């Protein structure tokens, strides 16, 4: 929405998406959307610094045919304002597996059964440095 946009991913199951960014000096909030495009996430991924009345928590959910699935909050947050941060996500059938900095991990259902990841946005207070694939 305003940051880096990327489609044709084609990222298959098992298959590791590395995101590496800058966490601003005064950052509030920041986006990574993964899915088929912007109506269809199976994962939006949103660490809330200070947004929307939370602090520190990092906030998930899907959306399917433009439709805010069910909420999930995770009780940690290894993010710091002003630091650089690597996101490594990848999916099953079953759920997608977020790997964060400080070795905390955890798992997100997998709602929409997509065939491929295609489509990853960014938005918010993180500025993308490096992508890969695997
Ligand atoms: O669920 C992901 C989306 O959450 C929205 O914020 C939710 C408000 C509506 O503003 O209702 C809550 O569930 C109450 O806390 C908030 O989480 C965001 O506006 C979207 O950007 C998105 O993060």
Known sequence: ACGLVASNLNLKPGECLRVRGEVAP????????????????????????NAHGDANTIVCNSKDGGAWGTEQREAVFPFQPGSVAEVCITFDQANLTVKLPDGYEFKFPNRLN????????ADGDFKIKCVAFD
Request: hydrophobic share 45%.
């Open 114 to 121: 997509l065939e491929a990841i295609n489509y990853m946005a």
């Open 26 to 49: 005064d950052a509030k909030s920041f986006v990574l959307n993964l899915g088929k495009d912007s109506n269809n996430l199976c994962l939006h991924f949103n660490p809330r610094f």
